[PDB]
Amino acid sequence: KVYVELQELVMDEKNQELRWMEAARWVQLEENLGENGAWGRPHLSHLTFWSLLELRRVFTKGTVLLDLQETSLAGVANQLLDRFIFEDQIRPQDREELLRALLLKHSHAGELEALGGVKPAVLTRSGDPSQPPQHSSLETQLFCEKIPPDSEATLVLVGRADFLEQPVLGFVRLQEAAELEAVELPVPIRFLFVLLGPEAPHIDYTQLGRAAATLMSERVFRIDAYMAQSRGELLHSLEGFLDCSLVLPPTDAPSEQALLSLVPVQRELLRRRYQ
Amino acid sequence: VYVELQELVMDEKNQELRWMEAARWVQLEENLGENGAWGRPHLSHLTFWSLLELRRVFTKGTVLLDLQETSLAGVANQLLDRFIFEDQIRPQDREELLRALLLKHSHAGELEALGGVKPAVLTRPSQPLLPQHSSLETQLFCEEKIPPDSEATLVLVGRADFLEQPVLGFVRLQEAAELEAVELPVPIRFLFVLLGPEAPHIDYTQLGRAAATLMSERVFRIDAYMAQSRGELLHSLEGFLDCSLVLPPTDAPSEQALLSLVPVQRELLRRRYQSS
Numbered sequence: 095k096v097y098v099e100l101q102e103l104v105m106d107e108k109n110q111e112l113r114w115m116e117a118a119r120w121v122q123l124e125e126n127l128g129e130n131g132a133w134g135r136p137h138l139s140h141l142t143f144w145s146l147l148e149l150r151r152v153f154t155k156g157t158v159l160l161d162l163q164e165t166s167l168a169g170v171a172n173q174l175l176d177r178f179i180f181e182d183q184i185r186p187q188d189r190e191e192l193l194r195a196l197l198l199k200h201s202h203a204g205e206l207e208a209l210g211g212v213k214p215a216v217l218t219r220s221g222d223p224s225q226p227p228q229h230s231s232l233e234t235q236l237f238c239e240k241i242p243p244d245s246e247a248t249l250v251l252v253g254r255a256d257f258l259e260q261p262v263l264g265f266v267r268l269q270e271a272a273e274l275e276a277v278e279l280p281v282p283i284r285f286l287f288v289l290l291g292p293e294a295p296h297i298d299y300t301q302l303g304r305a306a307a308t309l310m311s312e313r314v315f316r317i318d319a320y321m322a323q324s325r326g327e328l329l330h331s332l333e334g335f336l337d338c339s340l341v342l343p344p345t346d347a348p349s350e351q352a353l354l355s356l357v358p359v360q361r362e363l364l365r366r367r368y369q
Numbered sequence: 370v371y372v373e374l375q376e377l378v379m380d381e382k383n384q385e386l387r388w389m390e391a392a393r394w395v396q397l398e399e400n401l402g403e404n405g406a407w408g409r410p411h412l413s414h415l416t417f418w419s420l421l422e423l424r425r426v427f428t429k430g431t432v433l434l435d436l437q438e439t440s441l442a443g444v445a446n447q448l449l450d451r452f453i454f455e456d457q458i459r460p461q462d463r464e465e466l467l468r469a470l471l472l473k474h475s476h477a478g479e480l481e482a483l484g485g486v487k488p489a490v491l492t493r494p495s496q497p498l499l500p501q502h503s504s505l506e507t508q509l510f511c512e513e514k515i516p517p518d519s520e521a522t523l524v525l526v527g528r529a530d531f532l533e534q535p536v537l538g539f540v541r542l543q544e545a546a547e548l549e550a551v552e553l554p555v556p557i558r559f560l561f562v563l564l565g566p567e568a569p570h571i572d573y574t575q576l577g578r579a580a581a582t583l584m585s586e587r588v589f590r591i592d593a594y595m596a597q598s599r600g601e602l603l604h605s606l607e608g609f610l611d612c613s614l615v616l617p618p619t620d621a622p623s624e625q626a627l628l629s630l631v632p633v634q635r636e637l638l639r640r641r642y643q644s645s
Binding site: 122123144314339340343347352355357364368 | 411412413414415416417418420421505508509570582583586587588607609610611612613614615616617618619620621622623624626627628629630631632633634635636637638641
């Protein structure tokens with residue numbers, strides 16, 4: 095009952111340009127964008143164990159900007175990068191190339207079949223492509239091959255950069271919701287998630303993005319994200335989300351049975367609601 | 370195979386600390402009801418925190434492979450010595466931990482001959498100062514024959530407030546051996562020992578359940594027979610985690626929604642079967 099959009103830092107095949115490309119979206123359910131521009135089928139958001147483990151880790155020393163007075167992505171990006179520098183998340187020498195990347199064009203599904211299309215990219219110099227973990231995403235293989243007014247949006251940006259010493263998370267709640275060039279839907283953006291980092295074990299940045307987006311699509315954390323006045327309160331809410339997360343280990347069982355075994359366990363997990 | 374989870378508890382009649390059966394695995398999980406019947410068999414679901422903590426303690430776990438012992442007393446002495454060797458516990462902690470590991474091991478049949486059993490902590494007994502209880506599995510599911518071998522895994526979980534950190538001990542015996550801990554005439558091959566103090570996000574019962582569920586999973590069991598280092602056990606655990614599905618809290622639980630996850634569950638299981 096809100097809108098979340100995940101975009102990934104990529105290179106197209108026609109022009110070899112770096113750009114942000116829509117990869118998945120959330121309203122009631124999750125939809126994933128197929129290789130050639132078509133939306134896969136809606137599905138419940140399942141998460142990998144590693145993505146929640148890493149999300150919690152980067153959130154713990156996350157850079158948070160609450161009630162930020164900006165109305166442009168450029169304004170937000172300048173503020174976020176300054177706060178990243180202030181908290182020793184990135185080095186001042188990294189600022190100009192990250193700013194460049196954050197101000198790259200944001201493309202969408204409609205533009206994908208008019209591109210080559212899109213391939214995974216990594217930042218190295220300024221700002222040229224590299225791609226040095228799972229060539230086709232699980233959601234893409236399996237699912238490819240409702241929004242009223244206000245109705246505010248969450249934009250999740252995920253990008254790889256090898257010159258960064260560590261993966262960083264920026265979380266932004268804008269003072270006033272604002273339409274940005276980044277999102278095509280005329281839906282004002284309230285939240286921004288920025289996840290940047292180098293290649294590392296058990297860090298799939300697409301899945302890290304899916305976890306952040308799924309988190310913002312869940313009603314109780316989203317509410318807490320509106321009320322939060324510190325990083326500490328965001329983390330406490332993330333811990334409640336995890337408190338009420340259920341893990342299904344690999345089990346040799348009838349698939350529809352196994353998944354339906356999760357209902358009375360889950361139903362008991364959710365009260366007094368999550369937390 | 371057979372996996373049995375036992376918890377360190379105190380009874381109400383004699384007030385002695387003892388090990389009490391809490392759950393068992395024969396491909397599926399059964400949990401021991403308040404007194405003193407087994408609940409219905411069910412697929413093992415796990416809490417996120419229990420796996421996060423299991424991985425953490427396994428990563429620096431104390432491992433004894435092809436351990437030439439055939440008694441619980443023998444294993445416990447070797448394990449505690451190796452716990453100390455790896456700075457997991459302090460030598461001053463050794464004697465009360467040894468005392469506890471050799472306490473009586475009770476089973477389903479004797480539980481109603483006690484007053485009632487509550488979780489206990491080793492000191493120097495006290496009750497958990499942090500807010501835990503009462504297990505989800507007992508509430509939901511509480512309201513045994515395999516030949517030839519069929520070797521058993523015994524999982525022991527205990528709280529001790531003087532330990533500075535939670536520890537995991539993993540033991541594979543050289544030769545399968547009938548002991549004293551487990552009631553079923555089934556030879557024990559593997560031992561899991563999980564000991565530690567109270568900590569946020571550590572439910573030791575759930576940690577025990579995660580260890581047992583992992584031992585009930587066929588690919589890890591194979592890797593556990595072949596492993597020649599901790600590293601090989603960990604590689605199997607990471608694969609187990611790679612193929613785990615996490616179901617987050619949803620405001621609108623829908624069974625139609627869960628069935629969208631069917632090819633995910635199956636594909637995750639497919640990936641697990643392709644690994645070594």
